[PDB]
């Protein structure tokens, strides 16, 4: 699901957000086939919410909104 969606949202992307998504899909993928392989939910949400921490004073935030959504 993160392959297929992040392929359908590979563009329109702020490269901080592109390198973040593309690395971290890369390492769900890196961590697949481990016996102890998990999704990094809290991690992805918190980081995104770091760049919401920086963008958020202006409500001008709709590409970013669209990556955080």
């Amino acid at each position: 699901e993160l392959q297929d969606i992040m392929t359908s949202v590979s563009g329109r992307i702020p490269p901080n957000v592109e390198k973040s998504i593309k690395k971290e899909m890369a390492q769900y993928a890196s961590n697949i086939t481990s016996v102890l392989c998990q999704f990094p939910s809290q991690q992805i949400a918190n980081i995104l919410d770091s760049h919401a921490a920086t963008l958020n004073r202006k409500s001008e935030r709709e590409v970013f909104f669209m990556n955080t959504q």
Partner: protein, 69 residues
């Protein structure tokens, strides 16, 4: 003239936000505030719906929501 009403509802929710966020930092003190700000919005918008997103800027309804938690 309408400043009184405004200040009542906004502050009451500001305080509520302060108090709940206090609960959250207590929940995990190491996590930063900025991400927490957005996070609170995220938890609100997630649970209650985008329809109240703008409502976040509506004192009463956000006020109404914060008490109701």
């Amino acid at each position: 003239k309408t400043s009184r009403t405004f200040f009542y509802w906004r502050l009451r929710r500001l305080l509520l936000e302060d108090l709940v966020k206090k609960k959250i930092h207590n929940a995990n003190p190491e996590l930063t505030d900025g991400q927490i700000q957005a996070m609170l919005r995220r938890w609100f918008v997630e649970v209650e719906g985008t329809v109240k997103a703008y409502v976040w800027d509506n004192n009463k309804d956000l006020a109404e929501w914060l008490e109701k938690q």
